[PDB]
């Protein structure tokens, strides 16, 4: 992390599409280096379809500039995640900040 | 406020500490400014240039 | 033009400036030294500034 | 060998010195000719410049020597 | 001898191979 | 003449970092001995760092194993800082097997006769699925200094070996009031290690290296 | 054979190279060569880097 | 394997005079150049036993700033001129020498009386000058075995800065050097010059001996 920042790291990191941010909040159900499975809270759930959220993290792919764009999970198992909170820290990101 | 935060730790308020020289062990006159600066690594790598 | 092109530039000029200065009180003020060599082996042993 | 100030001031041109040393080293390298200065693990060029330094080679001496070896060449040829 | 040689200097592992082939050529065993 | 230092006392204040004390030292020799020992200790002390790793299911370090949430590079980095001690041999092949949900730590490694891990709570990785299993071999080795991978069997992941165990040597020179002869110094050497090399052993080997390299021109 | 030897970088080529690098100036040149002193000859000293 | 360092292989001992020697040592393990060189420098400069003048007394002066006729130079000059006197002594802890003279031109060290087994290594060192016939001096100088450099301040009676250590100038360098393939090893280069009491290489041997002896509760 920066350790002397300006409070704009969080917004910059979340406002690009790099980090896998939660669409409907819930409770984490299964974490892994290759995917995350989030159990949606029933209140937010649609009337049917018994949905859960699956997030397929990207693993070691080439960028345009020949760099490695991966995504590390940043939540433990059983961890409640609310709507709009990051899960995967893309390159140069740290807990959803911007670590250059 | 920077000084206040420096006091809240235990560090000297002027910002400058007194350093010793590794190769000779003697002390530097003129107290020197240490601290933690955020360094980047730019993508102009010497091995892509040679 | 005539000016030399080996002007010592920034760190070296600071070293020479700081070295060859004078301050109105320091360790070993006023003594007499037999020569430059004695000056070096005083400064290198902490007995004078 | 670091500077060639002496070798310059004894052949006072600095453009003639290049040709003189070049010719002497040509001799010292492909033709079978021997150094005149003690050799201290140096490439032929620096030997040539050191020769010029202590004042025992220049254009005049070189033309004299090559004409001398030519003379003895035909002296042996007629034998 | 048009084998794709590693150009000079570039090193390191081989993390991924991908083969696309057009409809009409029999896929080879690694394909 | 000159007095001679002796290791008067050791204050093993914690499990890692100690504070030996050398005394008495004639006027001014504290600085000389102190800096020499600091350079020698930080520069070259025999070490026991991991050197190679083999995990069953992975081919290259740039992939991921199903069940364990760390990328294999994270596992290699976590292993790199593992503080392991050996007694007799040069190299040795530890093994570590585990399954079920929980933090796979260093205490899991199959106990061997001569190897003794000194930091059990060093968490290596996390397992987060019931039918998930991790199983690896860790090739501890001996050496000195730092040796990157490039300077030195498709499965065998490599790691860079950083051998020296001493992390931070500080020292102080203070007046000693003993023997009725004032103006006599005392060198307090504080040293923080990863927790493998015993302090007195470290200072003994440092003095040995200094003297053994010094004798090369006691007769020139 | 010599080409294969240098391409494999045996232990002898380094001392050979240090011999053929002895008194052989090399011209260093920076990109916008503005005046006469932007090209200069130098004695090589082999470096690891 | 983990205890086989590189033993240095001394290149030479170049000489510039009887009291000026450039020593070299290559190759040492990376970084040992500074440890060895700096330890030697500290020992040679700070603590190396020797004997030298500490205090002179001249009959015709009562105070440091007192002048004197006949002589060509003031008291500061002659005091600073007695420092360079490269006296050598024997097992006696200290001893008082004396010089009395009244002659034209120079006043060298060769005229100091040999009341003892003390020895000089620069017999012609110029102590002072006496232009006039009546210009006469008579003084006594105390030489005591010492182990460093004690200035006047932190020591009828005239005090000279004692400089016991034989070394006038020690300074070293650490050039880069290689073996067959190893990246970077050090080449230590010492440039010693003494007063004359002992030739340089003997002083280096003495320094290595002091340090090795000091380090003999651990090996």
From Swiss-Prot, chain B:
Recall the taxonomic lineage recorded for the source organism.
Bacteria, Pseudomonadati, Pseudomonadota, Gammaproteobacteria, Enterobacterales
Q: Which organism is it from?
A: Escherichia coli (strain K12)
Instruction: Tell me the function of this protein.
Output: DNA-dependent RNA polymerase (RNAP) catalyzes the transcription of DNA into RNA using the four ribonucleoside triphosphates as substrates.
Coiled coil ranges (UniProt) are none
The entry sums up its family as follows: Belongs to the RNA polymerase beta chain family.
Q: Which gene encodes it?
A: rpoB
Which top-rank group of organisms is this from? Bacteria
Q: Where are the transmembrane segments?
A: none
Query: What's the PTM story here?
Result: Acetylated on several lysine residues in the presence of glucose.
**Protein name (Swiss-Prot/TrEMBL):** DNA-directed RNA polymerase subunit beta
Where in the sequence is N6-acetyllysine found? 7
Q: How does it assemble?
A: The RNAP catalytic core consists of 2 alpha, 1 beta, 1 beta' and 1 omega subunit. When a sigma factor is associated with the core the holoenzyme is formed, which can initiate transcription. The rRNA transcription and antitermination complex (rrnTAC) consists of RNAP, NusA, NusB, NusE (rpsJ), NusG, SubB, ribosomal protein S4, DNA and precursor rRNA; S4 is more flexible than other subunits. In pull-down experiments interacts with CedA.
* Biotechnology section: Co-administration of salinamide and rifampicin or salinamide and myxopyronin suppresses the emergence of resistance to both antibiotics.
UniProtKB/Swiss-Prot annotation, chain C:
Modification after translation is described as:
Acetylated on several lysine residues in the presence of glucose.
Q: Which domain of life is it from?
A: Bacteria
Biotech application, in the record's words, is: Co-administration of salinamide and rifampicin or salinamide and myxopyronin suppresses the emergence of resistance to both antibiotics.
Phenotypic consequence of residue 10 to P:
Resistant to antibiotics salinamide A and B
Q: Which family does it belong to?
A: Belongs to the RNA polymerase beta' chain family.
Q: What does this protein do?
A: DNA-dependent RNA polymerase (RNAP) catalyzes the transcription of DNA into RNA using the four ribonucleoside triphosphates as substrates.
Assembly and partners?
The RNAP catalytic core consists of 2 alpha, 1 beta, 1 beta' and 1 omega subunit. When a sigma factor is associated with the core the holoenzyme is formed, which can initiate transcription. The rRNA transcription and antitermination complex (rrnTAC) consists of RNAP, NusA, NusB, NusE (rpsJ), NusG, SubB, ribosomal protein S4, DNA and precursor rRNA; S4 is more flexible than other subunits.
This chain's protein is named: DNA-directed RNA polymerase subunit beta'
Q: Give the source lineage, highest ranks first.
A: Bacteria, Pseudomonadati, Pseudomonadota, Gammaproteobacteria, Enterobacterales
Q: Which gene encodes it?
A: rpoC
Swiss-Prot record, chain D:
Q: Which UniProt keywords apply?
A: DNA-directed RNA polymerase, Nucleotidyltransferase, Transcription, Transferase
Signal peptide (residue range): none
| A molecular function (GO) term | bacterial-type RNA polymerase core enzyme binding
Membrane-crossing residue ranges in chain numbering:
none
Top-level taxon of origin:
Bacteria
Described function: Promotes RNA polymerase (RNAP) assembly. Latches the N- and C-terminal regions of the beta' subunit thereby facilitating its interaction with the beta and alpha subunits.
Q: Which family does it belong to?
A: Belongs to the RNA polymerase subunit omega family.
Give the protein's recorded name.
DNA-directed RNA polymerase subunit omega
Q: Whose protein is this, by species?
A: Escherichia coli (strain K12)
UniProt gene name: rpoZ
Curated annotation (Swiss-Prot), chain F:
Q: Tell me if Kinase is a UniProt keyword of this record.
A: no
User: Which UniProt keyword terms apply here?
Assistant: Acetylation, ADP-ribosylation, DNA-directed RNA polymerase, Nucleotidyltransferase, Transcription, Transferase
E.C. number, please? 2.7.7.6
Ranges for the region named Alpha N-terminal domain (alpha-NTD) are 1-220
List the catalytic activities from the record. Answer: RNA(n) + a ribonucleoside 5'-triphosphate = RNA(n+1) + diphosphate
What post-translational events are described? (Microbial infection) ADP-ribosylated on both alpha subunits by the phage T4 protein ModA. ADP-ribosylated on only one of the alpha subunits by the phage T4 protein Alt.
Functionally, this protein is described as follows: DNA-dependent RNA polymerase (RNAP) catalyzes the transcription of DNA into RNA using the four ribonucleoside triphosphates as substrates. This subunit plays an important role in subunit assembly since its dimerization is the first step in the sequential assembly of subunits to form the holoenzyme.
Family membership? Belongs to the RNA polymerase alpha chain family.
The protein's name in its UniProt record: DNA-directed RNA polymerase subunit alpha
């Amino acid at each position: 992390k920066p350790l002397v920042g300006t409070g704009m790291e969080r917004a910059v990191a979340v406002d690009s599409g790099v980090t896998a941010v939660a669409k409907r909040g819930g409770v984490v159900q299964y974490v892994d280096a290759s995917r995350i499975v989030i159990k949606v809270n029933e209140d937010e759930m649609y009337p049917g379809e018994a949905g859960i959220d699956i997030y397929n993290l990207t693993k070691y792919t080439r960028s345009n500039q020949n760099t490695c764009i991966n995504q590390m999970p940043c939540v433990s198992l059983g961890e409640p995640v609310e709507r709009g909170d990051v899960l995967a820290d893309g390159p140069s990101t740290d807990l959803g900040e911007l670590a250059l | 406020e920077i000084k206040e935060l420096l006091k809240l730790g235990d560090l000297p308020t002027s910002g400058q500490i007194r350093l010793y020289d590794g190769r000779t062990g003697e002390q530097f006159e003129r107290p020197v400014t240490v601290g933690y600066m955020y360094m980047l690594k730019l993508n102009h790598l010497v091995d892509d240039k040679m | 033009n005539g000016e030399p092109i080996i002007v010592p530039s920034q760190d070296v000029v600071l070293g020479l400036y700081y070295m060859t200065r004078d301050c109105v009180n320091a360790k070993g003020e006023g003594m007499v030294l037999t020569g430059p060599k004695e000056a070096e082996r005083l400064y290198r042993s902490g007995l004078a500034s | 060998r670091v500077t060639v100030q002496d070798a310059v001031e004894k052949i006072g041109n600095r453009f003639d010195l290049v040709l003189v040393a070049a010719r002497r080293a040509r001799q010292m390298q492909v033709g079978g000719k021997d150094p005149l200065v003690p050799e201290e693990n140096d490439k032929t060029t620096v030997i040539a410049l050191r020769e010029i330094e202590e004042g025992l080679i220049n254009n005049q001496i070189l033309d004299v020597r090559e004409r001398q070896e030519q003379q003895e060449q035909e002296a042996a040829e007629l034998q | 001898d048009s084998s794709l040689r590693v150009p000079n200097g570039v090193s390191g592992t081989v993390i991924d191979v991908q083969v696309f082939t057009r409809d009409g050529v029999e896929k080879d065993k690694r394909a | 003449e000159f007095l001679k230092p002796r290791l008067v006392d050791i204050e093993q204040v914690s499990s890692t970092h100690a504070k030996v004390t050398l005394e008495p030292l004639e006027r001014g020799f504290g600085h000389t001995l102190g800096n020499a020992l600091r350079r020698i200790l930080l520069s070259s002390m025999p070490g026991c760092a991991v050197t190679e790793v083999e995990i069953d299911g992975v081919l290259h370090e740039y992939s991921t194993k199903e069940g364990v949430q760390e990328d294999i590079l994270e596992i290699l980095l976590n292993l790199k800082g593992l503080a392991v001690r050996v007694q007799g041999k040069d190299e040795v092949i530890l093994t570590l097997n585990k399954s079920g949900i929980g933090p796979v730590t260093a205490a899991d490694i199959t106990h061997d006769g001569d190897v003794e891990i000194v930091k059990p709570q060093h968490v290596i990785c996390h397992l987060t699925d019931e039918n998930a299993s991790i199983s690896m071999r860790i090739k501890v080795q001996r050496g000195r200094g730092y040796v990157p991978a490039s300077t030195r069997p498709i499965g065998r992941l490599l790691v860079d070996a950083c051998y020296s165990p001493v992390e931070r040597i500080a020292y102080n020179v203070e007046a000693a009031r003993v023997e009725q002869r004032t103006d006599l110094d005392k060198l307090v050497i504080e040293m923080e290690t990863n927790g493998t090399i015993d302090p007195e052993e470290a200072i003994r080997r440092a003095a040995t290296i200094l003297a053994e390299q010094l004798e090369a021109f006691v007769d020139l | 054979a010599a080409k294969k030897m240098v391409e494999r970088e045996e232990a002898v080529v380094w001392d050979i190279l240090d011999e053929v690098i002895r008194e052989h100036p090399v011209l260093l040149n920076r990109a916008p060569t503005l005046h006469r002193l932007g090209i200069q000859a130098f004695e090589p000293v082999l470096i690891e880097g």
